[PDB]
Curated annotation (Swiss-Prot):
PTM summary: Autophosphorylated. Phosphorylation is enhanced by vitamin K(2). Phosphorylated on threonine and serine residues. Phosphorylation on Thr-186 is required for full activity. Phosphorylated at Tyr-319 by activated receptor tyrosine kinases EGFR and PDGFR; this increases catalytic efficiency.
Activity modulation: Allosterically activated by various compounds, including ATP. Activated by cAMP; the nucleotide acts as a dynamic and allosteric activator by coupling the two lobes of apo PKA, enhancing the enzyme dynamics synchronously and priming it for catalysis.
S-S pairs: none
One example GO MF annotation: protein serine/threonine/tyrosine kinase activity
Official protein name in the record: cAMP-dependent protein kinase catalytic subunit alpha
Catalytic activity entry: L-seryl-[protein] + ATP = O-phospho-L-seryl-[protein] + ADP + H(+); L-threonyl-[protein] + ATP = O-phospho-L-threonyl-[protein] + ADP + H(+)
UniProt keyword list: ATP-binding, cAMP, Cell membrane, Cytoplasm, Kinase, Lipoprotein, Membrane, Mitochondrion, Myristate, Nucleotide-binding, Nucleus, Phosphoprotein, Serine/threonine-protein kinase, Transferase
Gene, per the UniProt record: PRKACA
Domain annotation Protein kinase: ranges: 32-286
UniProt xrefs under SMART domains: S_TK_X, S_TKc
Ranges where the AGC-kinase C-terminal domain occurs: 287-339
Lineage: Eukaryota, Metazoa, Chordata, Craniata, Vertebrata
Tissues expressed in: Ubiquitously expressed in mammalian tissues.
Residues the record marks as active site: D155
Entry GO terms, CC: acrosomal vesicle; axoneme; cAMP-dependent protein kinase complex; centrosome; ciliary base; cytoplasm; cytosol; glutamatergic synapse
Length: 339
């Protein structure tokens, strides 16, 4: 429909203007008070902070430059910030400020207090098909937007979907996102969600995001992922076999959609055929979905997370609290000139 085509044409114009002239150096560390560590990882962490003049809360991602270099993540870190400052969509967490100092890189994002989808799924066991479908529809629209900008996301998993104050999804962590016009080759992502062409070290494309959507829909509706096993090597053997067993409680329409997303041959996989995303939006499993109402946030959500206010951390867990130290000498200045 021409309305969708004109929406995506404007979205790409606005993205390219910011892509070609990125914002830089829009806050500094002593403009914020540190409150609590919300998550940790290999080269960085995310902290709840409060802005000292406005009182607004944010989620500040802190990356150690020396560790980014040692773990060979320089290009990935530069991709994450340049993409986040250029995108704009209802189901993506927004970047509000970025800056660097002698030791670290900082991305100051909006704080989403309802928790990871992963925590809520594991609490309740599994989601009903209507509940899974509401979240899946938001990921379909988000991938339609990103892929039209020539972006591949490459980190879909339940931990990266946050539930907001209206019960809608916001996608976080763009550390593996990349602008790709043809093929790309890096090994990255979490094992249970990798497409066969990544495990086999091929040149791959946006079809890996549609495979990961099949894994996510299966895990939401069953309570566990389709290729589960105790060690990565055994997970990878199941994935490239592609043999999938479905619970008897799944509907016939759900099984049919998942066989077409979890297709081992990327040239036959839904999302990657001549009709693109419309083979997914027009599938019988989505017949009750009002795509415009979801985009406009007019559908009542399946549940609203319990929290007391914009500063409540109850839906996140507890981590050892470490210093944010800044060296008196500059580190790795050349590598991060463009940040
Ligand atoms: C919550 C939140 N709001 N915005 C961001 C970037 C977050 C991260 C903090 C811990 C991770 O689970 C997600």
């Amino acid at each position: 429909q021409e309305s969708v085509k004109e929406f995506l044409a404007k979205a790409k114009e606005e993205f390219l203007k910011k892509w070609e002239s990125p914002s830089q150096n829009t806050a500094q560390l002593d403009h914020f008070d540190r409150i609590k560590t919300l998550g940790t990882g290999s080269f960085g962490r995310v902290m709840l902070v409060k802005h000292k003049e406005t009182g607004n809360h944010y989620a500040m991602k802190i990356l150690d430059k020396q560790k980014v270099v040692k773990l060979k993540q320089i290009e990935h870190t530069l991709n994450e910030k340049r993409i986040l400052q250029a995108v704009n969509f209802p189901f993506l967490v927004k970047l509000e400020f970025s800056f660097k100092d002698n030791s670290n890189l900082y991305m100051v994002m909006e704080y989403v207090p309802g928790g990871e989808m992963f925590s809520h799924l594991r609490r309740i066991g599994r989601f009903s098909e209507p509940h899974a479908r509401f979240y899946a529809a938001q990921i379909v629209l988000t991938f339609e937007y990103l892929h039209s900008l020539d972006l591949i996301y490459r980190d879909l998993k339940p931990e990266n979907l946050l539930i907001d104050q209206q019960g809608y999804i916001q996608v976080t962590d763009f550390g593996f996102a990349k602008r790709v016009k043809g093929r790309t080759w890096t090994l990255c992502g979490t094992p249970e969600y990798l497409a066969p062409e990544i495990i086999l070290s091929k040149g791959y494309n946006k079809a890996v995001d549609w495979w990961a959507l099949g894994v996510l829909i299966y895990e939401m509706a069953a309570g566990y992922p389709p290729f589960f096993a105790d060690q990565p090597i055994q997970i990878y053997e199941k994935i490239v076999s592609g043999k999938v067993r479905f619970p008897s409680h799944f509907s016939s329409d759900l099984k049919d959609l998942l066989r077409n997303l979890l297709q081992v041959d990327l040239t036959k996989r839904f999302g990657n055929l001549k009709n693109g995303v419309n083979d997914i939006k027009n599938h019988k499993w989505f017949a009750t979905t009002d795509w415009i109402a979801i985009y406009q946030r007019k559908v009542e959500a399946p549940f609203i997370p319990k929290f007391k206010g914009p500063g409540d951390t109850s839906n996140f867990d507890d981590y050892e609290e470490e210093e944010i130290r800044v060296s008196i000498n500059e580190k790795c200045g050349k590598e991060f000139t463009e940040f």
